[PDB]
Assembly symmetry: D2
């Protein structure tokens, strides 16, 4: 029932990315990013309970995924400092957002699943 | 289930529903004999394709019939279908998740293998 | 001016994939694939001069990228036996086809660029 | 040719993305982004002359690909506000960097092709 959930996959090992730092920001009135939520992916590669529907108000959100630390913890030098997704949430009604990221050392793919 | 298929649509930001999936096994004469079939559910998943008893070791081909998916939406695609060919259960029983992300002129596939 | 090009990229080293075997098969009237063209990607991970425009006719073509040999040479055990792309070519006129593939050990993505001469 | 190049592709129509705004930033000493370069994609979806070797110095760069405006011009409402790539460049000597982005309305994949001249 979480409005926002983040799923991270490893394309080199073919397993969920475990213990990946995820930071969520909201755009402020002065075009600044303020901290909104944080967490780390579980052993299933997904992060639940980031925020409730009461907090998850309409705005422009930034989901920052700390891919650099994850690849460094595996002894791999990556290219991107981080993989982050900027999107507008709850523009027309509350929706449940899933941010799926597929990670490689020098490339990444991200897709969104938006439902009601 | 030891073999699961998940399909996602990168154009509409939703799971791909009612997508035909056909599983083949390479025979002794390099021939693909039918093994399992189904269609993705409302969540874009295909459950209960096989059981570990009959999911013997061998080369398996998972054909995701993408062209029929796009024609039912009014889009003329490029690929005739998306096919994933892999060796399964070579070094002991495993659980396989085939994930595909579909675009009219592109697609990406990934696999998650977990030791039970 | 070749109407069929194959470009292959590596998503792990962030470099073009070099010396990747690429086999092109054409579908016959009895639902089997018969060889049409073959070659290996160059130092820039590209494959030009596969055939000629007149020889490249309407039909269903299969491009197999032998990714498993690429990963085994690199010392990585992959998941996919190969990356095969099957498409209908020249359905409504002579087009130029570029097949681009991005490779990871357990995943890959492919795309196509189609232009009208 | 140029130390920085951007390639943008469109996976919905299978053609290069034409006239796509690309912005390049450089991180300042106070952890702020200062403008570095900008341009629009050519007929082949490429950016050239965006910078040369001596301007393109070691640092943390942000390549912002304005995908939202591209999809609106096509009558498509996208998901991401932009495609946004942060990386460190020339940390061990000058390199040629090619950013390649494949765009879909609700997804995008980006890859880098780093070469040593």
């Amino acid at each position: 029932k979480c409005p926002l959930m983040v799923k991270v996959l490893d394309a080199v090992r073919g397993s969920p990315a475990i213990n990946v730092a995820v930071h969520v920001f909201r755009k402020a009135a002065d075009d600044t990013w303020e901290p909104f939520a944080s967490g780390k992916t579980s052993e299933s590669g997904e992060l639940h309970g980031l925020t409730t529907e009461e907090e998850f108000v309409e705005g422009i959100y930034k989901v920052e995924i700390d891919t650099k630390s994850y690849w460094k913890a595996l002894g791999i030098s990556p290219f991107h400092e981080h993989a982050e997704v900027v999107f507008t949430a709850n523009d027309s009604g509350p929706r449940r957002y899933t941010i799926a990221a597929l990670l490689s050392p020098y490339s990444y793919s991200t897709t969104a699943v938006v439902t009601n």
